[PDB]
């Protein structure tokens, strides 16, 4: 096809305010401040050849340690998970290689197309270490990306900002704005 | 001013390439005295931070910022490899 760039979004993307530049302290998170937002994903060109299927890596929800009972809302544990890259899987688009379904209950952190999928990244290291090297005997990779916008995430503080990192505000700056940037 | 390290690219990668330390510009040509070796690294071309939020309740079918706890995590992955040459010193 002719060269060109696509574009993906979400009608209810979890984007509080524009944190790239603000003239006054942002209002206050009410209920559902999600916005209809789109973006042009990171560019990726790659080709893997081998006599065994390709292997990828992505962060998923690791198994918890049998101790402290996971309080609801507690941050889930991470675990790098090796998987077989299947036809139709999604490529990291700028939000890294992770399982958004099992790591984002929100269902609104990223555009629809990766929103309930897993973005996997070729595990080049593992494949090349492979003793016989059947999984891949040749490859070409080309990826590039830059920050277009800087946003805030609505929701509630999962982990508070240690107060030794700042001086308490007052009035409007009395309440700390979400420092969960993306 | 507010900084900005522009776009990141494969073509500009420094890592995942072998470095052949044959001729050093210093007098110590790669000798690891003390059987020690220091490898310092800084790579901001993989600084993606991922936000993961858990729901406090899996009931209501209506979004409530109060129902979800937002967090941030970042992962780094390394793999160091070396080729060493045995050397002798007549004392």
């Amino acid at each position: 096809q002719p060269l060109g760039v696509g574009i993906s979004g979400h009608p209810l993307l979890n984007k509080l305010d524009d944190t790239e530049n603000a003239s006054a302290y942002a209002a206050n998170a009410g209920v559902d401040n999600r916005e209809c937002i789109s973006m042009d994903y990171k560019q990726t060109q790659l080709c893997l050849i081998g006599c065994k299927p390709p292997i990828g890596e992505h962060w998923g929800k690791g198994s918890p340690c049998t101790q402290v009972a996971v309080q609801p809302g507690d941050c889930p544990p991470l675990e790098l998970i090796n998987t077989v890259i299947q036809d139709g899987d999604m490529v990291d688009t700028g939000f890294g290689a992770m399982d958004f379904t099992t790591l984002q209950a929100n269902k609104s952190e990223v555009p629809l197309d990766i929103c309930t999928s897993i973005c996997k990244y070729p595990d080049y290291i593992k494949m090349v270490s492979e003793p016989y090297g059947d999984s891949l005997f040749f490859y070409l990779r080309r990826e590039q990306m830059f920050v277009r916008h800087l946003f805030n995430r609505a929701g509630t503080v999962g982990e508070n900002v240690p107060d030794d990192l700042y001086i308490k505000g007052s009035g409007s700056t009395a309440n700390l704005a979400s420092s969960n940037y993306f | 001013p507010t900084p900005s390290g522009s776009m990141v690219t494969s073509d500009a990668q420094i890592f995942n390439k072998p470095y052949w330390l044959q001729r050093a510009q210093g007098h110590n040509n790669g000798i690891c005295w003390g059987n020690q070796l220091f490898v310092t690294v800084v790579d901001t071309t993989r600084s993606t931070n991922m936000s993961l939020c858990a729901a406090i309740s899996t009931s209501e079918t209506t979004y409530k910022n109060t129902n979800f706890k937002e967090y941030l995590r970042h992962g780094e992955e390394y793999d160091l490899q070396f080729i060493f040459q045995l050397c002798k010193i007549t004392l």
Epitope: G171, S172, A174 | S57
Partner: antibody
């Protein structure tokens, strides 16, 4: 709806642990605020607790005297007072922050109050 | 800390008239102030938040206003059920502070 403990009578020097059980909402999203009122007198702020990680802020007056805790599994707040004296005899109240993890816009839901007599 | 004080600690009033209770902060709290009403056997009841906002269930004869450091609660056509002690509270900075209270009594 918040439920507090019944009346207490403790001897000077002793100690008491009082509960405030939460009901009618999702506790795991809210702090708990506690205050003090002596007979025929005004209100004073003790502290507030984030149950999740046990973080809490103290009014200097109640630093060594008060400790706050909470049972997430049963959604209950607790406050313990140490080395009790005649000045600690008062009615204590538990109260919920209006705005989730924020402590502004006042306290919108209060407990019935628990009376403590040191004698 | 921020110190809240109310003008009088007591007022003798008549049913049907307008009653005003003003509170003044030791510092600027910028409309971050609440009013509570308390009767002899129960917890204080929130009437005002954000200096001017009426809470659900609060009769419309109650209202509040002011700014900076000076605020006031106003009750029109005072009802007998309105006879109680009223408190202001600042929440602009911790520790949170309450005024000493103003008790309404009926004159005879």
């Amino acid at each position: 709806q918040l439920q507090q403990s019944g009346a207490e009578l403790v001897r000077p020097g002793s100690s008491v642990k009082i509960s405030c059980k939460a009901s009618g909402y999702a506790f795991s999203s809210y702090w708990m605020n506690w205050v003090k009122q002596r007979p025929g007198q005004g209100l004073e702020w003790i502290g507030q607790i984030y149950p999740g990680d046990g973080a809490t802020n103290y009014n200097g007056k109640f630093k060594g005297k008060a400790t706050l805790t909470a049972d997430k599994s049963s959604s209950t707040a607790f406050m313990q007072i140490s080395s009790l004296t005649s000045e600690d005899s008062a009615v204590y109240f538990c109260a919920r922050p209006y705005r989730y993890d924020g402590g502004v816009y006042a306290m919108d839901y209060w407990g019935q109050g628990t009376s403590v007599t040191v004698s | 800390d921020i110190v809240m004080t109310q003008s009088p600690s007591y007022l003798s009033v008549s049913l049907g008239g307008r009653v005003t209770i003003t509170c003044k902060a030791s510092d600027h709290i910028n409309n971050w102030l609440a009013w509570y009403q308390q009767k002899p056997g129960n917890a204080p009841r929130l009437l005002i938040s954000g200096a001017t906002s009426l809470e659900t269930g609060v009769p419309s004869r109650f209202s509040g206003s002011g700014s900076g450091k000076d605020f006031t609660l106003s009750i029109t056509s005072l009802q007998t059920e309105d006879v109680a002690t009223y408190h202001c509270q600042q929440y602009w900075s911790t520790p949170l502070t309450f005024g000493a209270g103003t008790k309404l009594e009926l004159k005879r």
